[PDB]
Amino acid sequence: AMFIQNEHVGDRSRMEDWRIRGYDPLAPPDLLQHEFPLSDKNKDIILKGREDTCNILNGKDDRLIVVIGPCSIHDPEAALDYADRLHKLSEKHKGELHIVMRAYLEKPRWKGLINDPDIDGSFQINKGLRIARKMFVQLTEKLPIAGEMLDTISPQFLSDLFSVGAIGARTTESQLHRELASGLSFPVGFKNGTDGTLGVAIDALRAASHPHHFLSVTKPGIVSIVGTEGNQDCFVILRGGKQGTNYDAKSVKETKEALAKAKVVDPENPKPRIMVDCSHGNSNKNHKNQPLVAADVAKQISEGEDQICGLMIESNINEGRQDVPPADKGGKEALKYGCSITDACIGIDDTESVLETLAQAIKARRGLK
Amino acid sequence: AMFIQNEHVGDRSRMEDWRIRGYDPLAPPDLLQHEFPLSDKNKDIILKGREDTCNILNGKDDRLIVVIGPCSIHDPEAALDYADRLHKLSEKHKGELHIVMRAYLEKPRTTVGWKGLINDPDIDGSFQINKGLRIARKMFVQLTEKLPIAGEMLDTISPQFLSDLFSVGAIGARTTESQLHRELASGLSFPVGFKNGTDGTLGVAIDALRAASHPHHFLSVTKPGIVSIVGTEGNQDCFVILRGGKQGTNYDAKSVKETKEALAKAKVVDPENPKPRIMVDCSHGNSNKNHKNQPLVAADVAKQISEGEDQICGLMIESNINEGRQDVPPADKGGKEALKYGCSITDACIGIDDTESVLETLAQAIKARRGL
Amino acid sequence: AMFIQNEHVGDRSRMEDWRIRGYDPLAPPDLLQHEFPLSDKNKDIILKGREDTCNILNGKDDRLIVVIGPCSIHDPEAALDYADRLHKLSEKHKGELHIVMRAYLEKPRTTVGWKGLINDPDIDGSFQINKGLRIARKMFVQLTEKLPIAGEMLDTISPQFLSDLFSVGAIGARTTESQLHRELASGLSFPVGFKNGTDGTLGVAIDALRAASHPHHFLSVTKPGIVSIVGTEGNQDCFVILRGGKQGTNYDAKSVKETKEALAKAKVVDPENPKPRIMVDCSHGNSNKNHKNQPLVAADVAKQISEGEDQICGLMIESNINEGRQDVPPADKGGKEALKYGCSITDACIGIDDTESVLETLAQAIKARRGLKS
Amino acid sequence: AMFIQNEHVGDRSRMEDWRIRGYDPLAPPDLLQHEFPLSDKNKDIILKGREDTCNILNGKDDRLIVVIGPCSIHDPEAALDYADRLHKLSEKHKGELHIVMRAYLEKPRTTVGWKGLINDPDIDGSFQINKGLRIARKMFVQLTEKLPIAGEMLDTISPQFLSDLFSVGAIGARTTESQLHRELASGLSFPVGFKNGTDGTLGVAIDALRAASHPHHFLSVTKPGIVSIVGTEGNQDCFVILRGGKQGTNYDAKSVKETKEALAKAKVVDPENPKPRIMVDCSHGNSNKNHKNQPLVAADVAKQISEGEDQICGLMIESNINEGRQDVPPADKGGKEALKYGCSITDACIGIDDTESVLETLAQAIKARRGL
């Protein structure tokens, strides 16, 4: 099965390896970046994506950050098509919305594109990293992209490509992910806990703003001690949870106050640091509810809310979701094009609509002054 | 300063490194294990510690696992003393208790404070990770010439340096949900415990158990110190740890009953042939952050065991030579050197007197449950 | 440009890097071997090639080892064509000759010129070592589905990428004295030959032979791509290569007699049970760098074999599809695309016609020596 | 028995590893450099050592380079004693001589014997390369707090651990022809010397000089300990070493004249405005392996210098505290502990008395050549 096979797997008399099947070799990040380098067009778009995100997060730009795209990418061809459509929507709304495409590769729980690119229970991580990076180089010739850092190694292969990132709810409390965020070159968002408490996300924001010293993988692929500077461009993501939804004006108000009390936002000159996820907890795992969540946020914006920095929306070419058929009944090749195999997404129609609603809300808020 | 310095730190026009100060070189796990190898005495004790833990967790042995020891070890000499005292108690109660010394190096803190033996072996606020790993591994090799030890996995890299020494382990509460630590547990050589959620719910710990029981493929650091893709087999020797939470303490018979039912519904324990997979943490949330409550919590578990409880596999207790805790003096007033011997600098622990009493209580409970 | 560029190149106030331009990333050997694995056909051919070489080197097989092929391979397509031709000759003469194709990738450049397939696969003065390793390994996996192959170890790292593929190897004359190459030889899985020194001395090759037979401990690159301390077992399957030198040619019966005596005196081959440990290079110094002389050198060795010489284990011959050599045209007037197919761009080789002839001569010499048993 | 042991050693059915016993982990150069860093004192001395060597090799400074010191260092304390004595001599003659201490760790041996400080620091036939590299680097850091040092490059990896410390270097005679060592020299930060061939001819050294002056691209070990492709700039600060050979000794005025002409013909030295690129080794072949001959060779070179010779850039002399040499006693007779202090265990050296005399002669020769 595996390249280097542990001949001693399952021998419990051994001291440390008998639950290791074996190992597969990995291209070092240096190597993968050499094979798939960035052009100047990549650099311009990625750097512009980071600057535009920071300017909103610092209250210098009155647009809204919109992280929007598939729950997870299983089909690079469909993702590039989607990027072409979103790019056009982006040019229409660039006066009001800073659109960043959601380029997530994995759903925590199918392990995702990097872990299992062939979607067949074979694990071809090295190939998956290649497929992932090449697609990201193609995506960022069109528009900036957003990522989820679920692990701490794979950012070494891909982190030059992101203009904004997020820590998964299941790892907001993880010291590993807070240290990771303190050394990334782009703003990072921290989701409230799965039980809906905001504390862990506020804690993560503060931890990530400080320098750290910690063990980590480096670009040649060896483990070293890293020193980070601290990342002050981070924000929280309201994403629902066991206590119910938290996109409403009352939850936003409690969140604004928590940020002030924690001394993260000056209440007299406030920076916007609240992103609302329209999906996941906040939609009750029903994609038809995402436009309703977005509209509620849009209404708060139109009425003068100035600390919501943006929204996250799970969106695809076609709405809904699908399971992967058995290889018996067609396998991966029998999947519908442009349709998520993880969380259900809104289709391209609701997407055009939701984007239009948000842009009007930004226009409405300008009228208020 | 740092060894390799990013001359470009803070230059935002750069694509990926401007929040990296630099790097310090790290001895690979291979190097450290070579300098501090295991003797055959080490291997015998560690393996026996693992075999005994599994036998209890598989319902093949009716003794109780007692993971007991300092909150965090800041003083390797005091820990070796404590280890000798605990070994004697271990010989006395070996008929009823499987004693495993708690060998934790750090108390996770979201706020400031001592980062632990690995990060700051000098207890002076410096970062000397290479030294700390040497100190830690050497101490563990000395400890496991006496008795088995239990470890806490807070990250996924430092286990590569130390995991050959543990007879049982636990994931920190703050990463029970983390896929990384669930993958880690699936490849370890010994049973791993997962703590209940901050809200007192078992779901995240049930999820972790099931995730850990399956094989995984993931990026990982290897003993030569390079990154590879590793494949694990899955770990079916894992268990849950009741440690309280916002709903209060959960060591009581009623909380244990709900926990048994939750495990059965999640199809983790057949309720008709039940394997004991509940470990009760007697400290932290379950003691109201008051060490004098730890013997009471233990007594309550002992009462349940004595009356026939057969799904509690063991207890965790924070125990030291002298009870309580102490702050580290300001270097103004003597620094680390002015510390009292054998007293925690993190969570308050029960002293050796309370420890002997607690162990006798639990042993009597196991004897009591046999008479039924 | 280079991938990681030393921003401080030429800053003589610095302690250690100011003559380093930079670095390019390298696939670790494990990675390259994972992408280009050996089939069972590869293994059977490679292993049989090693078994047959040893059996001749231990005097258990009365055939002749013939290492024959291009001086250096610059064109993988031509090398596969050549290998197909050489395979047929191998079936013809397998009763008498153990034919192993010469799969060398470069001619060491004391001054200037093409650095070889690994160092410069595009033959254009660009350096593309990572690509060169891929091309090299792929070609070897293709070659050894046809016939066993022989290599030259010029450096100590690139064997980590390729050494599972060779059935016999040789150390360059300019490094027979190198402790590095002697330690290297002690850990290889196949017989290794040591060439006599550039000044015509046999001592340095004899010294290397004994050094290579002992276990060693030394710094080395390993398959994951990190440097470790390796311990070897020692290689007792090594031999010397007579290749001419400043003292003139040394393929004649007189030099062969001197070499047998030196080997016996050095306690390298027991004079009472003598094993064949002499390989004659028909090119380089022994042909006066004139490819037309190689068949004459081979015939002279053949005569010695036919008259009963029993310590020559084989011959080395530089052979290509078409004889001679050619320079690389200026990119101005064509570049590599204007090279003659199947013609060396390093040392001049004999063509395919002379090759069939030389092989027939050597095979008859083995037949002749069998008749002396009467 | 080795750290990682090949379970399949000697299985000839395997494709590539059956002549490998196993592996031992190695501290990477980064780690070793972190533990034993250079102070500013080190840097000033090492850099001044390089700048003075270059100035002489470029004919901007009319002193003589004297690389002088033990054949090999087996005892770091005695070497530090020697360096302090030589430092005093260096201050006395700094007007005429640029003194660089010879800091060699091994005597190359095809034959059996002590493998040197790095391979066998304990001088007991064991292999403890990690320990040896630590001892070696720490000593070099101590030596270069006193005076610049000269090294010999026998392999291409261990220079990664030590090359920040040398102010001048040399390729071993057995690898002057080696492409690997020519590439190495093109990337080093200090002048490098190439010895004439065993047969007394200059060809291999001339070729090596020209190859080293050009940029190269090659596989190499890097400071983090991984293998990469390195690109070098070329080293035009290299020179040749006359060291005898089968044609006899080659330190005499006739041999120097032939060497001058060969360098000019090879277009390595401007024949009209000559830069000095000839270093005369007073030991080894040129002394008939008899240390008492070294001062005579030196006096002969001094005679040439005083009479106007301007293309000899320096001398190498094997010098120790006490003259001669000694074998390492067997373990039943005492072992390394029974060694005489300050006495070579490899090549015989001249002692401290001959050393002072030789240096005074050479300085007078430089003074003489100025009076001219």
Side-chain angles (χ1 to χ4, degrees), chain B residues 139-285:
Chain B
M139 174 184 68
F140 284 181
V141 177
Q142 290 168 314
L143 288 175
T144 58
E145 267 176 319
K146 309 176 185 274
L147 78 184
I149 62 166
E152 186 162 50
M153 257 84 52
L154 299 168
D155 71 311
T156 55
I157 290 175
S158 87
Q160 297 291 313
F161 294 85
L162 302 169
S163 89
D164 53 326
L165 294 147
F166 298 137
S167 308
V168 61
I171 305 301
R174 289 169 50 177
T175 49
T176 306
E177 271 180 301
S178 175
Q179 198 67 17
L180 300 74
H181 291 70
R182 299 168 174 192
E183 281 158 355
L184 177 79
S186 65
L188 294 172
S189 317
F190 48 83
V192 179
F194 298 95
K195 293 182 177 74
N196 67 253
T198 293
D199 42 310
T201 56
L202 275 70
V204 304
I206 301 289
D207 288 348
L209 222 111
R210 289 189 304 187
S213 68
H214 289 129
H216 294 270
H217 285 255
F218 51 96
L219 305 180
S220 173
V221 167
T222 55
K223 290 191 26 225
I226 59 150
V227 231
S228 290
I229 297 153
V230 64
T232 63
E233 280 281 341
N235 189 346
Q236 295 180 14
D237 293 340
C238 294
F239 56 96
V240 301
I241 300 169
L242 298 177
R243 57 112 179 179
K246 292 183 185 177
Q247 288 297 115
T249 76
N250 54 14
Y251 59 83
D252 43 287
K254 185 172 290 184
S255 302
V256 167
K257 185 192 175 189
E258 293 173 351
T259 297
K260 291 184 274 181
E261 286 167 351
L263 287 160
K265 171 171 174 164
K267 306 196 179 163
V268 159
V269 179
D270 176 73
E272 307 293 353
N273 278 328
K275 292 179 176 54
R277 294 295 170 115
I278 299 167
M279 180 163 288
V280 181
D281 185 346
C282 294
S283 196
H284 306 117

Side-chain angles (χ1 to χ4, degrees), chain A residues 12 15-16 19 21-22 24 50 115 150 173 175 184-185 194 221 223 225 227 229 231 233 242, chain B residues 12 15-16 19 21-24 50 174 177 180 188-189 199 201 217 223 225 227 229 231 233 237:
Chain A
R12 289 171 163 255
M15 296 310 304
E16 60 179 331
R19 281 202 248 259
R21 284 178 175 175
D24 287 340
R50 293 174 184 173
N115 202 257
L150 169 48
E173 276 185 283
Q175 190 61 17
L184 291 171
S185 317
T194 58
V223 51
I225 301 153
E229 278 279 294
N231 187 346
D233 294 336
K242 293 184 183 179
Chain B
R12 291 173 167 255
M15 291 306 306
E16 57 184 327
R19 284 203 173 98
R21 284 182 175 178
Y23 308 82
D24 285 345
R50 291 174 183 174
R174 289 169 50 177
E177 271 180 301
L180 300 74
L188 294 172
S189 317
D199 42 310
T201 56
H217 285 255
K223 290 191 26 225
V227 231
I229 297 153
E233 280 281 341
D237 293 340

Side-chain angles (χ1 to χ4, degrees), chain A residues 2 9-10 12-26 29 33 38 42-43 46-47 50 54 106 108-109 111 114-115 123 125-126 129 150-157 159-161 169-171 173-179 181-187 194-195 197 203 206-207 211-233 242, chain B residues 1-2 9-10 12-29 33 38 42-43 46-47 50-51 54 109-110 115 119 127 129-130 133 154-161 163-165 173-175 177-183 185-191 198-199 201 204 211 215-223 225-237 246:
Chain A
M2 286 194 88
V9 66
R12 289 171 163 255
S13 70
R14 293 182 61 91
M15 296 310 304
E16 60 179 331
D17 65 8
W18 58 270
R19 281 202 248 259
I20 306 304
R21 284 178 175 175
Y23 308 84
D24 287 340
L26 186 68
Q33 276 180 2
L38 300 173
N42 294 112
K43 291 169 172 179
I46 300 167
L47 290 174
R50 293 174 184 173
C54 292
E106 164 172 15
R109 246 171 298 105
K111 298 287 300 201
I114 288 180
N115 202 257
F123 294 95
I125 297 175
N126 199 67
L129 281 169
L150 169 48
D151 81 313
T152 53
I153 290 171
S154 89
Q156 301 293 310
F157 295 88
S159 87
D160 53 332
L161 292 148
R170 292 167 192 72
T171 47
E173 276 185 283
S174 169
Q175 190 61 17
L176 300 182
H177 292 71
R178 298 169 175 192
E179 285 155 355
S182 66
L184 291 171
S185 317
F186 46 83
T194 58
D195 49 45
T197 69
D203 289 349
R206 288 187 307 191
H212 293 271
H213 280 251
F214 55 99
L215 307 184
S216 173
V217 168
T218 77
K219 299 276 239 73
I222 57 151
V223 51
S224 293
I225 301 153
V226 221
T228 63
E229 278 279 294
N231 187 346
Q232 293 183 71
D233 294 336
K242 293 184 183 179
Chain B
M2 285 196 85
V9 66
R12 291 173 167 255
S13 70
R14 290 174 56 88
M15 291 306 306
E16 57 184 327
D17 63 5
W18 57 267
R19 284 203 173 98
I20 304 304
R21 284 182 175 178
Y23 308 82
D24 285 345
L26 184 75
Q33 278 184 7
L38 276 36
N42 293 111
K43 293 172 170 182
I46 299 165
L47 290 173
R50 291 174 183 174
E51 293 164 4
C54 291
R109 49 219 334 166
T110 167
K115 299 292 301 199
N119 283 310
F127 280 101
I129 295 177
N130 263 311
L133 282 171
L154 299 168
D155 71 311
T156 55
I157 290 175
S158 87
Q160 297 291 313
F161 294 85
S163 89
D164 53 326
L165 294 147
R174 289 169 50 177
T175 49
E177 271 180 301
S178 175
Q179 198 67 17
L180 300 74
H181 291 70
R182 299 168 174 192
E183 281 158 355
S186 65
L188 294 172
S189 317
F190 48 83
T198 293
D199 42 310
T201 56
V204 304
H216 294 270
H217 285 255
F218 51 96
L219 305 180
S220 173
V221 167
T222 55
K223 290 191 26 225
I226 59 150
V227 231
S228 290
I229 297 153
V230 64
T232 63
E233 280 281 341
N235 189 346
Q236 295 180 14
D237 293 340
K246 292 183 185 177

Side-chain angles (χ1 to χ4, degrees), chain D residues 177-246:
Chain D
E177 277 181 277
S178 174
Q179 190 61 17
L180 304 76
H181 289 71
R182 299 170 177 193
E183 284 156 356
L184 173 76
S186 67
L188 292 172
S189 318
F190 47 83
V192 178
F194 297 98
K195 292 180 175 74
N196 67 251
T198 300
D199 45 318
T201 44
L202 272 66
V204 303
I206 303 290
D207 289 350
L209 228 81
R210 291 189 306 189
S213 69
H214 288 128
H216 295 271
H217 282 252
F218 53 94
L219 302 180
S220 174
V221 170
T222 65
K223 291 195 38 271
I226 60 148
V227 58
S228 246
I229 298 151
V230 68
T232 63
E233 278 277 337
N235 191 348
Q236 298 181 80
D237 291 342
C238 297
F239 59 96
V240 300
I241 299 171
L242 297 177
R243 59 109 180 178
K246 293 184 184 179

Side-chain angles (χ1 to χ4, degrees), chain D residues 12-281:
Chain D
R12 291 174 165 257
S13 70
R14 292 179 59 89
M15 294 308 306
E16 53 183 325
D17 64 8
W18 57 268
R19 282 200 173 96
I20 306 301
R21 280 179 176 174
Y23 307 82
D24 288 343
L26 181 70
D30 268 358
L31 191 62
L32 197 75
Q33 279 185 7
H34 181 63
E35 178 161 14
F36 298 104
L38 298 192
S39 73
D40 293 319
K41 192 169 191 46
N42 295 110
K43 293 171 170 182
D44 290 348
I45 291 176
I46 300 168
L47 291 175
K48 185 180 186 281
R50 294 175 182 176
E51 187 178 351
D52 282 338
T53 304
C54 289
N55 285 334
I56 294 165
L57 291 168
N58 289 317
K60 296 178 179 164
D61 177 32
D62 82 328
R63 294 180 308 160
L64 214 50
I65 306 162
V66 182
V67 173
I68 179 164
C71 167
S72 80
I73 294 165
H74 65 282
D75 171 12
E77 288 297 84
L80 285 169
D81 174 10
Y82 182 87
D84 207 284
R85 309 186 192 220
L86 184 61
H87 180 256
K88 298 307 156 303
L89 298 174
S90 170
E91 295 305 300
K92 173 171 201 177
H93 293 127
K94 67 185 176 192
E96 298 71 56
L97 312 179
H98 165 48
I99 290 190
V100 178
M101 182 179 160
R102 172 179 168 116
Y104 294 16
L105 299 181
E106 170 177 17
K107 170 79 171 177
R109 263 192 288 274
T110 168
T111 53
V112 107
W114 177 57
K115 297 294 176 275
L117 193 57
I118 288 177
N119 281 309
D120 180 13
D122 285 359
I123 319 182
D124 59 348
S126 73
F127 281 93
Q128 296 182 74
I129 294 175
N130 261 313
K131 190 186 175 169
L133 283 171
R134 297 166 45 70
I135 286 156
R137 190 175 167 88
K138 186 184 167 192
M139 174 184 68
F140 282 176
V141 176
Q142 288 173 311
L143 291 173
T144 56
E145 269 176 349
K146 307 175 185 274
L147 77 184
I149 64 165
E152 189 162 50
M153 263 73 68
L154 296 171
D155 74 312
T156 52
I157 293 174
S158 88
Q160 297 290 311
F161 296 86
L162 305 170
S163 89
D164 54 332
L165 291 149
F166 299 129
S167 307
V168 60
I171 303 304
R174 286 168 46 174
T175 49
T176 308
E177 277 181 277
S178 174
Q179 190 61 17
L180 304 76
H181 289 71
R182 299 170 177 193
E183 284 156 356
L184 173 76
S186 67
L188 292 172
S189 318
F190 47 83
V192 178
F194 297 98
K195 292 180 175 74
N196 67 251
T198 300
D199 45 318
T201 44
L202 272 66
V204 303
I206 303 290
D207 289 350
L209 228 81
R210 291 189 306 189
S213 69
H214 288 128
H216 295 271
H217 282 252
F218 53 94
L219 302 180
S220 174
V221 170
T222 65
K223 291 195 38 271
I226 60 148
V227 58
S228 246
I229 298 151
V230 68
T232 63
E233 278 277 337
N235 191 348
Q236 298 181 80
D237 291 342
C238 297
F239 59 96
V240 300
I241 299 171
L242 297 177
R243 59 109 180 178
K246 293 184 184 179
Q247 290 183 327
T249 78
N250 56 20
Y251 60 84
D252 44 285
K254 185 187 70 59
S255 304
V256 169
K257 186 189 175 188
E258 294 174 351
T259 298
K260 291 190 273 182
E261 287 165 351
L263 289 163
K265 169 172 174 165
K267 308 195 181 163
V268 158
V269 179
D270 176 9
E272 310 292 354
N273 282 323
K275 290 180 175 54
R277 296 297 169 118
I278 300 170
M279 182 166 291
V280 180
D281 182 349

